[PDB]
Amino acid sequence: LAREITPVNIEEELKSSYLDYAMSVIVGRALPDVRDGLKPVHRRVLYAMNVLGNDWNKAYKKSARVVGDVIGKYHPHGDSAVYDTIVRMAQPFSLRYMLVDGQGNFGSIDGDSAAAMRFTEIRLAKIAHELMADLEKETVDFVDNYDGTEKIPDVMPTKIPNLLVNGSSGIAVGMATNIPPHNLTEVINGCLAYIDDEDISIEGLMEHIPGPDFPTAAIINGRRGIEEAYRTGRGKVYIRARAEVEVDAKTGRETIIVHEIPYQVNKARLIEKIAELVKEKRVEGISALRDESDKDGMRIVIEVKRDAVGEVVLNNLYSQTQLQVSFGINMVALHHGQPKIMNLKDIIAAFVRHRREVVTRRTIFELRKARDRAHILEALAVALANIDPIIELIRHAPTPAEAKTALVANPWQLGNVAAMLERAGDDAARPEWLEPEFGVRDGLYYLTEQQAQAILDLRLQKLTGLEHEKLLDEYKELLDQIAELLRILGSADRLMEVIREELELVREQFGDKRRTEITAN
Amino acid sequence: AREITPVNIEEELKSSYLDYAMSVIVGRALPDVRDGLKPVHRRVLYAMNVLGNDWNKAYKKSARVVGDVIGKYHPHGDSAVYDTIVRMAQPFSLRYMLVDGQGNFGSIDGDSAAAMRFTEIRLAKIAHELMADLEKETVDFVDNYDGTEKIPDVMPTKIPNLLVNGSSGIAVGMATNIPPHNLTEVINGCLAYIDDEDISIEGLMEHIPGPDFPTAAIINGRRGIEEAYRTGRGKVYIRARAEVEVDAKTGRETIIVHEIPYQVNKARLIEKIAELVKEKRVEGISALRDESDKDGMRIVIEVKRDAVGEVVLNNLYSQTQLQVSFGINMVALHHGQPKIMNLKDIIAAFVRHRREVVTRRTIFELRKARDRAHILEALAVALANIDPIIELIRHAPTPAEAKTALVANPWQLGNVAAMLERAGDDAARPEWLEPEFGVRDGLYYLTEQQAQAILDLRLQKLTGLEHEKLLDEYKELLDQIAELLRILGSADRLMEVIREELELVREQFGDKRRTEITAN
Amino acid sequence: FTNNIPQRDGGTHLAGFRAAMTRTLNAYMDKEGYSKKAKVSATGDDAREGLIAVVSVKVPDPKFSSQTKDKLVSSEVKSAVEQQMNELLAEYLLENPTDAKIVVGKIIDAARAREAARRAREMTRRKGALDLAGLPGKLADCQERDPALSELYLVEGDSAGGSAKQGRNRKNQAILPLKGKILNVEKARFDKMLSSQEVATLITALGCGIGRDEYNPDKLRYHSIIIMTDADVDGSHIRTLLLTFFYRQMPEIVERGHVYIAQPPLYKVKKGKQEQYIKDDEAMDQYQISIALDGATLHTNASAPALAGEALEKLVSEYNATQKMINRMERRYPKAMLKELIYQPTLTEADLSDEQTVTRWVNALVSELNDKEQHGSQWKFDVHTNAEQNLFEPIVRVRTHGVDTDYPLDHEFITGGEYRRICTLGEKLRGLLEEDAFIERGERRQPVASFEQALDWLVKESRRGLSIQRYKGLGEMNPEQLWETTMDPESRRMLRVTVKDAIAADQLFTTLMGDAVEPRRAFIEENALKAANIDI
Amino acid sequence: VASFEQALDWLVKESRRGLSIQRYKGLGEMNPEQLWETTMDPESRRMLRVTVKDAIAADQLFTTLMGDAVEPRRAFIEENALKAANI
DNA sequence: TTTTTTTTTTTTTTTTTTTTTTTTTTTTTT
DNA sequence: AAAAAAAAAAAAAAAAAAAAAAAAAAAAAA
């Protein structure tokens, strides 16, 4: 009826609006995808940087330009949040392996905030390029942006297990994810073990992956939390600071030196809290408190009084202030576009399945490209064999269309060079869509419209003697490449060989040492 | 190389403040006399043009344009580039808007524009004619702050943007304040100057009676306009359009303000009227309302029965901001230095700019046409003798050897090539080419570029129709070269071209007067 | 009518007719002073009371919302009808005084009845230039002193506030811009209600300080409170927060029906001259389908007439519903199998008794899957002899990405309802495309081998000149666009908030908006499962 | 080459082949290590002591450049512009 | 020994303010 | 009459805050 006013129930409107908001947040800002381990914001930011050409071996670009490109094209949710995401990706105390290379002030663990968008400059890290390898080979599905004027990837064809490696943290409506970082070498070793035996136990995966590895080195107190998290997806882990108790040789006084602090702990807030506890007489025996972080470590001096044990004071500080914190693991991620609590083996299996899909799609694309180029090279070789009557036909023709019709209508003899060329790999080297009407048929080659157009686009520069041999060599190389790609597609073992070689290369290039210590308790 | 070196406070202060003063005066504060733009406007328009924000293309988000301007060209941080874009987009500021924005861009009521993430930006149609023939090296390009790119030093304008849109900016030593004008009248003044270069300021006053603000209004005097257009400085009083409406049923009167002066906020105006009424500084006001119903504006001021109404209106003119004194101060950069300048100086500077732009464009087009004619001569000679050229290219082992053979061999002129080449004669060879090459005693001597173009020739172009295409293109290029040489040779033809362009600009973007000049 | 074709659902011509009639009658009432004597302002649905009209239009290239042709979405028609009506109806009113006076008498009687229908109230002091009345500085108040004629628009910020303030009617519309997301009163303590954002709404509404001994809804300053947030996800969230505030703190206002919801459009879509506003993604999908079937003809043979537009619409609707179902069933079975099952013959439960027939059917299915394959997957069949029920359930193996999996088509899958719908769509599309079939979109010609090719070609041709403008809030809409869509009472589309059941409303508010997370997560998961499992 | 202009232009163009300039729009664009290397470390510092050679001349310069009156400031700026333009 | 309210993430929605610089006017104060 | 002080026009330098949405630890009321 198209009435100006209609009734709506408070229940129906509330339910529809809140369910729409909750599902939108859950699927589209809060949780990461299990495959590439990135949220949509990170995916769109990296895609914008890659499209601009912020390569790891090129000059920096200002954050304002990248943020404007992200907001204008891909991500319509305001520039301040996008710049904060870029800042978190650039800084090294947040991510275990930084996806962005920063040039300027990006904050610190002392609590300093990052510089404004107009000062800093950004650039992709070298790891982010392997996070987007073979993106151009249609290895992942592309989806429209908010306007529909551009295309964004649905997922990145990653070579790194970014979810386990860099972790994640987000607050959806019903859900909330919290995944710690890990060591890339240990994670790749676990992936290789899973590839070797897919019925591998969580005990074996934990032998290869002893536990998390935060960007700030520290001590993990227990292991029961790690085992519970990696066998169920939830568990509390206690992270302690690498404090000590120095004893002066000359005098009997003592000092406590905090070399490291837990993950996601602010130095300034921690020092303020310790000062408040000392002022309120909550913790006794603290003679003084300062920082001596002289860019050769991280030194926090806590002087002990003469009438104090010192170790008792250190234990009291571990109990009370934020020198010990509990990391609540909650491994929630999007799997098949829905939230799911998942353990370590599920994440590794999802990554290996993603690698299978990516390599198969890449091989299909490369095979199609090679077959098309071989088709064009067959046309060019057959044309160069019969270049004189082709020149006569084109000269006699009034227009290029008549030349196309004449070339298509006239079958062509191969000649010695093309006949010798088109002997090895005559089968399984033609494009699949090509009908049997065209191609070689009892010596006489038959051209298509595309081949005739390619022949007409041939230049006089390529009529020299050397370019003919160049075309023959290119055709032989394409035949070898097609044979190798078909061998990859035929055998499932060769797919695993290729994936294992790629993972070993990734472990070699970006391998790193473990920072934390998983002590027993 | 001392760690610490004493410096006098006088020298440091002088050097630092003079650096700041010269930088502000040259770069940011004052506009350029030729294109009428500041560097911010120039860089914004150049960034939008490079992005391809055409007037008929779809809009783009303002954040993308601001980020592109800041990242590449303008090193002075966002949130001022967006403010300049907002001012260029909104119509009550500029007489002819250079940006066609979408969304909330503010209002005379005093609403601020929407944030950067909401609005969208697109060039106006007139902004393209402000940047016409930029690609034809008609202006000098200056390097970027990083040196990675280049920016125009000045736009090759067709509109007198300084007189048309006006300007307002504050430098350290100076300060400019130029009102806007009507484009048809300013173009008529330019044409009058072209017709008679020794024209007095009275004739330019006849063609250009005064400024034409985007908000229609009334200008009381004319001696201020005459002083501004003679000396470059004058005071102009801008009155509001207010009429005392007498009701027919009863004798009560209401003052209805149809239009407001330039650069006056309606909200502050109504607040000041309310303050005057509450403090009893203006008597006779019964009620005060705003009734702007999206059909102009309407500020109703009900007058009490015990009040004349005309007296109340005169008091509102004298006390309130319904009258504003617009101080004209025509300071603009001329040859990279500030200078107070009158109307005839601005018109002469614009005409000199158009002379330079048209001459540089004609030189560029002549060079391009001569180069293309050279390549077409090469292709025609190759098509005349395609058989031995095919033989030589086939027998050569590498393309470099083929180029050397083609350059070494002097080639016979075909009958079609013989008729084609001799008709053109001179005035088609490029200037840089030596006399060694070209036609010499009925034999064409190819160059290296011509041989490379022949080797790049496709088999598609051996057809019959493409030979006729090359012949027709060569004849058209000969005619174009003749026309360009005629334009460059004569100084009267240069002014004919400039006058035709100005007349076309007046035809496309013609507009009527908005403000009224009166005698009082 | 449009070219002697009726339009049940009106169209642009109907809107132009309504707007012109209302404008002319209001102008005539204001000029002659009948409104002043009666002391009542006429509104919409009173000038249309007891009316008969026929609006015939002849467009050369009409454009309709659907092949059923119930709406005319041609943008060119509204302006011409509006201009001609605004001239000639005013000329008619000037020439004929008696009939105009009689019609004005009828309109005044209707307006008096409408005013009599309303409840008792009191005129309220309004923010003005001379007097502010202690109201917020961000309130752009109206000139009407009487409530039940004024209306308050609650918007999301100062940019949306400016966009709404520039385009409105100062006599009635008042705007109170908020600041982003507001407090969740369900979670927040009552002491936290003393906040800058929420106190602004309390001051303007004048329901006192939402206390037990002070909340008096009779002193409400506007009897129409309109929640005009943005047209996106966070706008919906802020709408839910505002509904929580109104229901929990001022339940009498919601019961009396003063709360309204505006529906601004999220998208504007343009194709050459024509423009249109779209609300949500499903409306965008329907519009895309409508353009795809706009001037589209499908021939089953080289020499055969084009199909009916409504029949093609029904086919495309069934196909899209089945494709959505197949996307829902991506977890259970491969998409390629489910798509291929459309074109294969139906398999009934009686066929399961025989073994050779099932082997032939699954062999044909797997052969067609292998023939049309364009990835690395390889399809193979296998029949499992169920000795319990004497059945033969086929199984289709697939080795995709080097991973082998089995997808047995159980006895429940044959009679699962999803396969019934697939079979019905197959029965529609067994032979609607011969070898020589093609489609046209004017002078363009395209032979098509399958329905997917025809649909894809139609979509690609539809999206050639298409341009889409997504509004990320009301600050991106011009004031004219925001006025014409969801501020003008003629072209308004509002929703009255009402409480169907108090107990259910309280339970839903507590579950969705309370402190406890477990019922909220359970509710979200259950609704996600219900959405996924719509088709049995 | 055939002119000094051609040689200088070719030399400059080859100079700017691999070049890359990073302009710092304030200290927020510099890394803290770059700040330490340049202008915080006392080893590699380059400072300047502010000193007053003449009190009267300093007072006159401060009043002219920073006072309320604009005309002496304009005259000073114009005189320095002319001095820069001339030898 | 037990409730209750407060801090912290990291993506989202929203706004706000202080100076420099020059003419010109309007207050207000003597 | 007279001086001094405040505001606003447009490009520059700087920054400041309020809420949702989960978990999980303090730190007081009860």
From Swiss-Prot, chain A:
Mutagenesis / variant outcome for changing R44Q: Nearly abolishes DNA supercoiling. Reduces quinolone-induced DNA cleavage. Slightly reduces DNA relaxation
Effect seen on changing H75A: Nearly abolishes DNA supercoiling. Reduces quinolone-induced DNA cleavage and DNA relaxation
Chief subcellular location: cytoplasm
Superkingdom in the source lineage: Bacteria
Keywords for the protein's UniProt record, in alphabetical order: Antibiotic resistance, ATP-binding, Cytoplasm, DNA-binding, Isomerase, Nucleotide-binding, Topoisomerase
Known outcome of mutating S80W: In PPA-18 and strains 233 and 227; quinolone-resistant
Gene Ontology biological process terms, A to Z: DNA topological change; DNA-templated DNA replication; DNA-templated transcription; negative regulation of DNA-templated DNA replication; response to antibiotic; response to xenobiotic stimulus
Catalyzed reaction equations: ATP-dependent breakage, passage and rejoining of double-stranded DNA
EC number: 5.6.2.2
Activity regulation information from UniProt: Gyrase is the target of many classes of inhibitors, including coumarins, cyclothialidines, pyrrolopyrimidines, pyrazolthiazoles and (fluoro)quinolones. Quinolones bind GyrA when the enzyme is complexed with DNA and trap the enzyme in a covalent reaction intermediate with DNA. Coumarins bind to GyrB and are competitive inhibitors of its ATPase activity. Cyclothialidines also bind GyrB and are ATPase competitive inhibitors; they seem to act differently from coumarins. Pyrrolopyrimidines inhibit both GyrB and its paralog in topoisomerase IV (parE).
Subcellular locations according to the entry: Cytoplasm
UniProt effect for mutating G78C: In NAL-97; quinolone-resistant
Family under the similarity heading: Belongs to the type II topoisomerase GyrA/ParC subunit family.
The name this protein goes by in its record: DNA gyrase subunit A
Organism in which the protein naturally occurs: Escherichia coli (strain K12)
Stretch of the intact protein here: 4 to 524 of 875
Curated annotation (Swiss-Prot), chain C:
Name of the coding gene: gyrB
Record-given protein name: DNA gyrase subunit B
Superkingdom, taxonomy of origin: Bacteria
Record field: catalytic activity: ATP-dependent breakage, passage and rejoining of double-stranded DNA
Its EC number(s): 5.6.2.2
UniProt remark on domains: Consists of 3 domains; the ATPase domain (residues 1-220), the transducer domain (221-392) and the toprim domain (393-804). ATP-binding is cooperative, and both subunits must be wild-type at residue 103 for supercoiling to occur. Non-hydrolyzable ATP analogs (and ATP-binding) induce dimerization and enhance ATPase activity. ATP hydrolysis induces domain shifts that are probably part of the mechanism of DNA cleavage and rejoining.
Molecular function, one GO term: metal ion binding
Stretch of the intact protein here: 269 to 804 of 804
Residues at which Mg(2+) 2 binds: D230, D232
Annotated Gene Ontology cellular component terms: chromosome; cytoplasm; cytosol; DNA topoisomerase type II (double strand cut, ATP-hydrolyzing) complex
Activity regulation: Gyrase is the target of many classes of inhibitors, including coumarins, cyclothialidines, pyrrolopyrimidines, pyrazolthiazoles and (fluoro)quinolones. Coumarins bind to GyrB and are competitive inhibitors of its ATPase activity. Cyclothialidines also bind GyrB and are ATPase competitive inhibitors; they seem to act differently from coumarins. Pyrrolopyrimidines inhibit both GyrB and its paralog in topoisomerase 4 (parE). Pyrazolthiazoles also inhibit the ATPase activity of GyrB.
List of residues binding ATP: Q67, T68, K69
Main location: cytoplasm
UniProt similarity note: Belongs to the type II topoisomerase family.
Naturally occurring in which organism (per UniProt): Escherichia coli (strain K12)
Enzyme class: isomerase
All residue ranges annotated as the Toprim domain in the record: 150-265
Biological processes per GO annotation: DNA topological change; DNA-templated DNA replication; DNA-templated transcription; response to antibiotic; response to xenobiotic stimulus
UniProtKB/Swiss-Prot annotation, chain D:
Disulfide-linked positions: none
Free-text domain note: Consists of 3 domains; the ATPase domain (residues 1-220), the transducer domain (221-392) and the toprim domain (393-804). ATP-binding is cooperative, and both subunits must be wild-type at residue 103 for supercoiling to occur. Non-hydrolyzable ATP analogs (and ATP-binding) induce dimerization and enhance ATPase activity. ATP hydrolysis induces domain shifts that are probably part of the mechanism of DNA cleavage and rejoining.
Superkingdom of source: Bacteria
Complexes and interactors: Heterotetramer, composed of two GyrA and two GyrB chains. In the heterotetramer, GyrA contains the active site tyrosine that forms a transient covalent intermediate with the DNA, while GyrB binds cofactors and catalyzes ATP hydrolysis.
Segments crossing the lipid bilayer: none
Coiled-coil regions listed in the entry: none
Gene name for this UniProt entry: gyrB
Identification of the protein by name: DNA gyrase subunit B
